[PDB]
Structure formats: structure tokens, C-alpha cells
Amino acid sequence: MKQLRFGLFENAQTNDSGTATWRHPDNQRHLFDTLDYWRNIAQICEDAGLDFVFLADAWGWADVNGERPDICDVEGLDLPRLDPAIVAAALIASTTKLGLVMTGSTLLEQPYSFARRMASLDHLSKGRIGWNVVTTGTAETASAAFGVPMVAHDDRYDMADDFMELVYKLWEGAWEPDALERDKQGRYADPAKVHRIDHEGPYFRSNGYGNTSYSPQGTPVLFQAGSSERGRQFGGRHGECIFLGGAPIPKLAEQVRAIRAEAVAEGRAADSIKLMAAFSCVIAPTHEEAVQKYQEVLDSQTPEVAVASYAWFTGLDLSSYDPSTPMSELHTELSQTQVARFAGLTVGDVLADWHAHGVRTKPVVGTPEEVADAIVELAEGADLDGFLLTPVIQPGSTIDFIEHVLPILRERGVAASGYDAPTLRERLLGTETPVLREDHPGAGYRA
Amino acid sequence: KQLRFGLFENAQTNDSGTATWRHPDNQRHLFDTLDYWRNIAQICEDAGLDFVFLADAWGWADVNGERPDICDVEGLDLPRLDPAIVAAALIASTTKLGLVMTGSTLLEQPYSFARRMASLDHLSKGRIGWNVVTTGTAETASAAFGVPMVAHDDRYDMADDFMELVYKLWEGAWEPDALERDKQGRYADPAKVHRIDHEGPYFRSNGYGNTSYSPQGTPVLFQAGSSERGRQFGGRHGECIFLGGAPIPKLAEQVRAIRAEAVAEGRAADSIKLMAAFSCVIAPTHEEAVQKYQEVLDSQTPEVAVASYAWFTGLDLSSYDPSTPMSELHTELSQTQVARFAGLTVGDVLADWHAHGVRTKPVVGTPEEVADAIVELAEGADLDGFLLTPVIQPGSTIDFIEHVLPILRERGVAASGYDAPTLRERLLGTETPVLREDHPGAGYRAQSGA
Numbered sequence: 005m006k007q008l009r010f011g012l013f014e015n016a017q018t019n020d021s022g023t024a025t026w027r028h029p030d031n032q033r034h035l036f037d038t039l040d041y042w043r044n045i046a047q048i049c050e051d052a053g054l055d056f057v058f059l060a061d062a063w064g065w066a067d068v069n070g071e072r073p074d075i076c077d078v079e080g081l082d083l084p085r086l087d088p089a090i091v092a093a094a095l096i097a098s099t100t101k102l103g104l105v106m107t108g109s110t111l112l113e114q115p116y117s118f119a120r121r122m123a124s125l126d127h128l129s130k131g132r133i134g135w136n137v138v139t140t141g142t143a144e145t146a147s148a149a150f151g152v153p154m155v156a157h158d159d160r161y162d163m164a165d166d167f168m169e170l171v172y173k174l175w176e177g178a179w180e181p182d183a184l185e186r187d188k189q190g191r192y193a194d195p196a197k198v199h200r201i202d203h204e205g206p207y208f209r210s211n212g213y214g215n216t217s218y219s220p221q222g223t224p225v226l227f228q229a230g231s232s233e234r235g236r237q238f239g240g241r242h243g244e245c246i247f248l249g250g251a252p253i254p255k256l257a258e259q260v261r262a263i264r265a266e267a268v269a270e271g272r273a274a275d276s277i278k279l280m281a282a283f284s285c286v287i288a289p290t291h292e293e294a295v296q297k298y299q300e301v302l303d304s305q306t307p308e309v310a311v312a313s314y315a316w317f318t319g320l321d322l323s324s325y326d327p328s329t330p331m332s333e334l335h336t337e338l339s340q341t342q343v344a345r346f347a348g349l350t351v352g353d354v355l356a357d358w359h360a361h362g363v364r365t366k367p368v369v370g371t372p373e374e375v376a377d378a379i380v381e382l383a384e385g386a387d388l389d390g391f392l393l394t395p396v397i398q399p400g401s402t403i404d405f406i407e408h409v410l411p412i413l414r415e416r417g418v419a420a421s422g423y424d425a426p427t428l429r430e431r432l433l434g435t436e437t438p439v440l441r442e443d444h445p446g447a448g449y450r451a
Numbered sequence: 452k453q454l455r456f457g458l459f460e461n462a463q464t465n466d467s468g469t470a471t472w473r474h475p476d477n478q479r480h481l482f483d484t485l486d487y488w489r490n491i492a493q494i495c496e497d498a499g500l501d502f503v504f505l506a507d508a509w510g511w512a513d514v515n516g517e518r519p520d521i522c523d524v525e526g527l528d529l530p531r532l533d534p535a536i537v538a539a540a541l542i543a544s545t546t547k548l549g550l551v552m553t554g555s556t557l558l559e560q561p562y563s564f565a566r567r568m569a570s571l572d573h574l575s576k577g578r579i580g581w582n583v584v585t586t587g588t589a590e591t592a593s594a595a596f597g598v599p600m601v602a603h604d605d606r607y608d609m610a611d612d613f614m615e616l617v618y619k620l621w622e623g624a625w626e627p628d629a630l631e632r633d634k635q636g637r638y639a640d641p642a643k644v645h646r647i648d649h650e651g652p653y654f655r656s657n658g659y660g661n662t663s664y665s666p667q668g669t670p671v672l673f674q675a676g677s678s679e680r681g682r683q684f685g686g687r688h689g690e691c692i693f694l695g696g697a698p699i700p701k702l703a704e705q706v707r708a709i710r711a712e713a714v715a716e717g718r719a720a721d722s723i724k725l726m727a728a729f730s731c732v733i734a735p736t737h738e739e740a741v742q743k744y745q746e747v748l749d750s751q752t753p754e755v756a757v758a759s760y761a762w763f764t765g766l767d768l769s770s771y772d773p774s775t776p777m778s779e780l781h782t783e784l785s786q787t788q789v790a791r792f793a794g795l796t797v798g799d800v801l802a803d804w805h806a807h808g809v810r811t812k813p814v815v816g817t818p819e820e821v822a823d824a825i826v827e828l829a830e831g832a833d834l835d836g837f838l839l840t841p842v843i844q845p846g847s848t849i850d851f852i853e854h855v856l857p858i859l860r861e862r863g864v865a866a867s868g869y870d871a872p873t874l875r876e877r878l879l880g881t882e883t884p885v886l887r888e889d890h891p892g893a894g895y896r897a898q899s900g901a
């Protein structure tokens with residue numbers, strides 16, 4: 005049996021994904037800016053043996069023509085947030101084995117300082133760091149915030165390739181793994197193992213030494229989730245663990261086959277890339293109890309939010325249209341035969357499903373046995389290597405999965421019983437060594 | 452007058468042109484382990500020190516245009532860790548200790564720097580400080596980032612623009628009570644959340660800030676520029692100014708000039724705090740302290756001094772007989788350097804450099820002698836505290852805490868412990884955690900004036 009890995013999707017802000025369940029009485033996400041919130045989440049995850057916590061990030065915000073509507077602040081749709089690298093570092097200090105994965109942007113980070121920061125996390129954590137490589141999902145606002153011009157979608161990925169090449173040189177080529185000797189009767193470092201790098205790319209330039217010596221993993225575990233044609237090529241080249249949003253099993257299976265074919269086209273083994281699907285659930289001892297439990301979180305969300313956030317995430321201002329109007333009865337846009345995928349849905353239908361989960365994956369709602377069976381049928385049907393648990397409320401959604409579903413998966417032998425490897429790469433990739441595989445591009449920048 | 456005490460640290464093994472890492476009691480070769488930092492922070496927090504300060508650098512040694520092998524054999528310059536990451540890890544290990552980190556206005560981007568510092572301030576409940584630098588490793592650091600070099604005085608003009616932008620983000624973007632998080636009312640009050648607009652010579656920003664108003668608003672601002680332009684910048688923005696060691700009459704003049712600069716910027720002379728770097732070597736008798744210091748100096752490889760002197764000054768003295776008067780090298784010296792070296796030989800210069808690099812010269816003696824030196828400095832130069840710069844770690848810090856700090860507390864010149872939750876309250880001696888109204892950053896508050 006393939007043993008699935010599990011990570012927890014989190015972000016350093018109250019609400020996410022176009023939903024706003026922060027008003028639910030048991031939701032603690034409004035305390036995201038306190039260290040106690042994060043210490044508790046991490047302890048829950050580490051005591052359960054979850055492989056990692058993943059901190060999503062964004063730099064921009066939801067806006068309509070340069071302005072956030074009141075609702076953004078009355079319901080905390082987007083802002084405020086914290087920086088994930090700072091949260092990750094704080095969590096290092098209260099964990100020993102839990103993996104820590106953070107989003108970091110190739111569009112807005114400077115590679116030289118970013119490489120030093122990530123390698124610092126990797127040193128202090130003893131090799132537990134991952135990096136979710138993003139360009140931007142909020143390109144308009146994030147660019148204005150940093151004072152830089154727009155970069156079009158595919159050019160963002162060419163910039164990301166150049167970024168990756170430089171950070172690979174800094175992580176893998178600047179200091180050999182054994183450069184540091186720290187012998188008070190010998191050498192501090194072997195001068196033959198410390199190298200100047202030289203990089204002249206279309207977007208970035210660097211000439212000189214790297215600040216950080218070779219870290220326990222070398223390069224953080226690389227996560228990536230792009231679904232465009234160009235983003236799929238980028239993930240096929242660099243990504244070690246690829247995230248997928250929820251989809252019906254047959255569609256997910258085809259996407260998995262496509263992503264593994266992109267890795268093969270870049271010279272990598274098909275099984276050397278790990279696929280993890282977002283997965284949400286609401287668990288209760290009976291099916292009806294779960295439905296009511298899910299219902300109570302849905303009822304906690306203000307009804308005006310659904311229309312507001314659907315607008316931003318898609319562009320369709322639906323406040324006007326009566327809920328009985330078929331979607332296909334509207335224009336706005338979409339490329340004909342795509343409009344047929346709507347298959348005669350009504351505005352009410354879309355907003356009700358959007359109210360339910362936004363861009364988060366549709367939760368599996370049922371008993372522990374029902375949720376466990378869903379996980380297994382997803383993993384087997386789509387050839388997945390793990391799941392990214394996306395909570396509907398914190399910490400309850402995580403606690404429920406840990407206390408009721410994970411033990412079933414463990415008894416069935418589909419989930420490991422605990423931490424068997426000390427670095428994140430060894431744990432997620434099954435590698436023997438904590439460092440990149442030889443068929444990964446970053447390995448080609450080693451001395 | 453209650454003196455404040457901070458610990459000067461950096462996230463690398465050696466610093467300041469010296470290299471005492473081979474001393475049997477030095478543990479700084481473990482700088483890249485969390486356990487080293489956990490231990491330092493506990494030692495400091497248990498003693499009630501006001502803060503730990505993390506220096507930083509981005510560049511490396513450049514001796515005759517190359518990086519010679521001795522830089523790696525002795526770990527003179529590299530490797531290092533990022534101080535924001537060390538600081539964040541130390542947040543989670545401490546509850547009251549202040550954490551001050553260096554951050555460069557030349558190389559950081561202000562929008563993400565503002566968010567990073569405000570995140571540290573939120574998570575720490577207001578215990579963060581920022582030592583504002585314009586990089587000192589400018590040449591090599593610029594090449595690493597791929598950017599053109601910027602002149603000394605231009606760096607301070609860029610720094611003024613950087614400060615204006617981060618003040619808008621920290622003080623002007625979210626009012627202090629914008630967040631209500633009332634599950635029956637509003638998450639945030641939309642009238643208290645503001646777009647910023649900034650169009651400066653070096654930086655541009657248009658939009659909202661990522662982080663809401665943090666417990667101190669703006670981190671406590673530390674600064675250490677000693678040039679004329681750097682003193683002007685400190686007098687405008689710095690809340691705590693760090694001075695290197697010097698004889699009492701010289702420190703007193705520097706303190707006087709910095710306070711006059713603050714007054715000219717519209718601030719109260721006493722609202723800026725002056726802290727001197729202070730090093731010491733402590734033993735139970737004077738003679739034992741002298742010998743202890745000799746054993747520190749003997750731990751440094753003899754070949755280091757001439758190589759690190761060349762790194763810091765550009766002057767390679769390795770080919771000269773040590774009896775050579777510096778005056779004979781005038782073709783390689785500016786007029787100011789010739790005057791400063793007058794009477795000195797190459798051997799004098801390298802002997803002095805071997806003993807302490809650019810670190811302050813230690814007071815060497817008994818605990819009573821060191822305590823007396825601290826009081827004399829503070830009274831004679833009008834200082835508000837001291838930045839303890841260790842010669843070896845953790846020994847230098849432990850010696851001071853165990854033997855000198857109790858004397859200072861008995862004499863009533865150092866506080867018993869922590870009776871202020873934020874770093875600004877503790878260091879400025881105020882009940883208010885946010886910038887004073889006569890500070891430039893306060894003018895960006897939307898609260899009555901935007």
C-alpha cells in the first residue's frame with residue numbers, strides 16, 4: 005500500500021478563499037496575529053504526526069478599481085495578514101519534527117536575500133522547510149504596492165525560471181556540503197569548497213559569494229500549484245510536490261497524469277514528483293450530525309460576502325440578477341462552448357455553492373468512516389501521494405480529522421503511524437538523503 | 452538615572468576584524484544552531500537585560516580584490532544567518548526580552564520589510580527594534596544583489612525616502628483601533644483602514660498595507676552613523692543612538708552633538724537615548740583579568756590581523772618591517788590618515804588591530820573596576836545605557852551578568868528587572884508604547900492629521 009502524506013493548509017490571516025466563517029463561535033482564526041494561535045496549531049499537528057503545516061501567502065488584496073469596498077473590512081475578507089517566513093521561524097522554535105512550508109513570490113522577493121532567509125530557516129529547523137513557489141495571484145494590487153510595473157502572466161514564469169537558477173546557485177553551488185569543518189585545531193572552513201557564483205539572467209544578476217553555507221536539505225522542498233499551460237511546465241521542471249485543487253476523481257486522475265508527463269518531459273522520473281490534492285471535510289459521529297454541523301458554519305457567514313467575493317474571483321457582478329436566471333442566459337463573457345459547462349445552472353445555484361466553499365475544495369461531509377473511505381477512493385482513483393487538509397474552521401476542522409479519521413487511515417495502513425524521517429524531503433519524497441535528487445534541475449548547480 | 456543594557460550579537464562566528472573562535476571556551480562556531488540562540492536569550496532574559504541586538508552584513512571580505520583563503524580557514528566574514536529569522540525564533544523562546552535587528556535601507560524593499568517587522572512586532576507583543584543601516588559592505592553587497600553602487604551621502608537620502616514609506620505603512624495605513632474582531636459586529640472599521648500613496652525619489656507605493664497597527668506601531672529605531680550626514684539622519688529618526696567606544700571626553704562631545712542635532716529637528720534633547728558599546732574582561736583579581744585577556748588575544752591566529760586590516764581599510768601592510776613608520780607610507784594614505792597615524796609604526800597599527808579590530812577596547816579588571824568604569828562613562832558622557840559587546844560567548848555575557856550587573860543593581864543605576872512590556876516603554880522610560888508626537892513617524896498617523 006502507498007502511504008499517504010498529510011499537510012495542513014493554513015494562512016496568516018483570518019479568512020481565505022473568498023469565504024468568511026470567522027464569526028462561527030468555535031472559530032479561532034481571528035487570533036492569527038498571536039503567537040499562541042500558531043503554537044497551538046503546530047502542537048496539534050506535530051502530536052498527530054502530520055508531515056507539515058503549509059502557510060499560504062498573498063501580497064495584494066481584493067479591490068474594485070483601486071478601492072476595497074467596506075465589506076472587505078467589516079468581514080475581514082483579505083487583510084490584514086502576517087508574513088509567513090516570520091510565522092514559520094517562530095514555529096521552528098516550538099517544534100522538532102513538523103515540516104514548515106511557506107509561500108514565497110518570485111515576482112516580489114529579491115533572490116539573494118530570499119535565498120539567505122530560506123537557508124537560515126533550513127539551518128535552524130535542521131532541514132524541515134519547504135517553499136511554495138508562486139508568482140502572484142493578485143498581480144495588479146501587489147505590483148502597485150511594491151511600486152513596480154505589471155509583468156504579464158507567462159513572462160512571470162520566465163522570471164521565475166531565472167529566479168530559480170540564481171537561488172539554486174546560492175543554495176547548491178556556493179558552499180559544498182562539507183565546506184564547514186569548525187575544528188579549533190584545524191580549519192574553520194575548507195577554502196576549496198567555498199565558491200564565487202556568477203549569474204547574469206534576463207531578470208536577475210549576482211556576482212560574488214553566498215551568505216549561507218550548505219543547509220541540511222540544500223534547497224527547501226519545492227512546492228508548486230500552477231494550472232496554466234505555462235505554470236504546468238514550470239511545476240514539471242522544478243516542483244517536487246505539486247498541489248491540485250479539488251476535482252471529480254476522473255478529472256483529477258487526468259490532471260495527475262498530465263503533471264507526471266510534464267516531469268518526464270523535463271527528464272525527471274514520473275514517480276519522483278508527489279501529487280497532493282486539497283481536501284476538506286466536516287466530521288461527526290452520524291451523517292445527519294455532520295450535515296447540521298456543516299450547516300451551522302455556512303449560516304455563520306454573512307450572505308453579502310458570497311456575491312462580493314464571487315465578483316472579485318471571477319469578475320461577474322451578480323448583485324443585480326435574480327437567483328432564477330440561468331447562467332447561460334447571461335453573457336458578460338466566456339468562450340461559448342465553455343458556457344456549456346454551466347449546463348443551465350441558475351444564479352442562485354452558483355452563489356449558493358460559492359457561499360459554501362468559495363475556491364476552497366468542496367468538503368466531504370459525513371462520518372469518520374465515510375470521510376476515510378473518500379480519502380482512499382481519491383488516492384487510489386487519481387494516483388495521489390497525499391492530501392493538503394483545508395480546514396473550514398480552526399482549530400476544530402484539524403482536530404476532528406486527527407482524532408477521528410487519521411486513526412482509521414493508520415489502522416488501514418494507508419497513513420504512516422508517525423515521524424520516520426527527520427527532514428521534510430526524506431519524509432515527503434522517500435529519498436535516502438535530505439538533498440535534491442540527481443535528476444532534479446537544482447542538482448545540476450552543485451560544484 | 453537607570454541605565455539600560457543590551458547584548459551585541461551577530462549571527463556568525465567572528466566579527467569586527469577579529470577571530471577568537473579557536474578559544475577553548477568560545478561557542479560562537481555554533482551560531483547556526485537554534486540551541487546556541489536559545490541559550491543566549493535565556494541567559495539575557497533571566498538576567499533582565501533589556502534586549503539582544505543582532506548585527507548584520509550582506510557582503511564579504513575583499514583583500515586586494517580577491518577573497519583570500521584565510522577568510523575561510525579562520526571564518527573571518529562568512530557564513531552567516533539572516534537576523535530576522537533568528538529574531539523570530541527567539542520571540543518564541545522568550546516573553547519579555549527585547550530583540551533588535553539590523554536591516555538595510557539600501558537592500559530591503561520597504562513594503563515587504565514593513566510587513567516583516569510588523570509581523571515580528573505582533574508576534575512578540577511589542578518587543579522589536581530595528582537598527583537602521585545603509586549597509587557598510589556596500590561594494591560587495593551591491594554586486595551580490597546585482598544593483599549599481601550608490602554614494603555614501605546618496606544612501607542616506609535613499610534612507611530618508613525608505614523611512615517615509617515605512618512610516619506611512621506602519622503609522623498611517625491602519626489606525627490603532629481599526630481591528631474590532633467582534634463576531635457580532637465588525638471585523639474591522641472601514642473608516643480606519645487607509646490607502647497610502649508614496650511617490651519618492653527612490654521608492655513608490657500605492658495601495659493598502661498588509662499588516663494592521665502593531666503593538667508599538669513602529670519598531671524602536673536604533674541608529675549608529677558617525678559621519679556628518681549619518682549624525683543628521685540619526686538625529687532626525689533615531690530613538691536610540693549607538694556609539695563606539697572612546698575616551699570619556701570624546702564620547703561626551705559626540706553625545707552633546709547628537710542631542711543638539713535632535714533639538715534642531717524639533718525633538719527634545721533628552722528624548723533620544725545614547726548607548727555606548729562596552730566590552731570587558733572580568734576576573735576576581737586585576738592580575739587574573741590581565742592574564743585572561745592575554746589568553747583571548749593568544750587564541751587568534753597571528754596571520755589574521757594583517758589580512759583583516761586590509762579588508763577593513765584597503766591597506767596591505769604585510770610586506771613592511773613592523774618598525775616602519777606609517778608616515779613613510781603616505782603615498783597610500785589620505786591626508787587625514789597620515790595625521791591620524793602620526794608617530795605610529797606598522798607594528799603599532801597591527802598590534803592594536805590584533806587586540807580588538809573595530810570592536811571597542813575592553814575594560815579589563817575586577818567586577819568592581821568594571822562597574823566603576825560603567826558608572827564613570829555614564830556620568831561623564833551623559834549616556835543612557837550600554838551595548839555589551841562580548842569578546843567570547845557566552846562567557847563574556849555570563850561574566851557581566853553574574854558579577855558586574857549585581858553591583859550596578861546594588862548601587863541603583865540598573866533596574867532590578869522587567870517593569871514595562873514593550874521595548875519602547877522600557878528603553879524610553881515612558882508609559883507609551885508608540886512614537887512620540889515630536890518624532891517624524893508620528894506625523895503620518897491618520898489619527899488627527901492625514
Ligand SMILES: Cc1cc2nc3c(=O)[nH]c(=O)nc-3n(C[C@H](O)[C@H](O)[C@H](O)COP(=O)(O)O)c2cc1C
Nearest residue numbers: 060061107138140141229230231232235247248249
Ligand atoms: C492548494 C493551492 C494553494 C495555493 N496557494 C497559493 C498562494 O499561497 N499564493 C498564490 O499566489 N497562489 C496560490 N495558489 C494559486 C496557484 O499558485 C496558481 O497560480 C493557480 O493554480 C493558477 O495557475 P497559473 O499560475 O499557472 O495561472 C494556490 C493554488 C492551490 C491549488
Ligand SMILES: Cc1cc2nc3c(=O)[nH]c(=O)nc-3n(C[C@H](O)[C@H](O)[C@H](O)COP(=O)(O)O)c2cc1C
Nearest residue numbers: 506507553584586587675676677678681693694695
Ligand atoms: C555599535 C555599532 C553597531 C553597528 N552595526 C552595524 C551593522 O549591523 N550593519 C552595518 O552595516 N553597519 C553597522 N554599524 C556601522 C554604522 O551603521 C555606520 O555605517 C558607521 O558607524 C559609519 O557611519 P556613517 O554611515 O555615518 O558613515 C555599526 C556601528 C556601530 C558603532
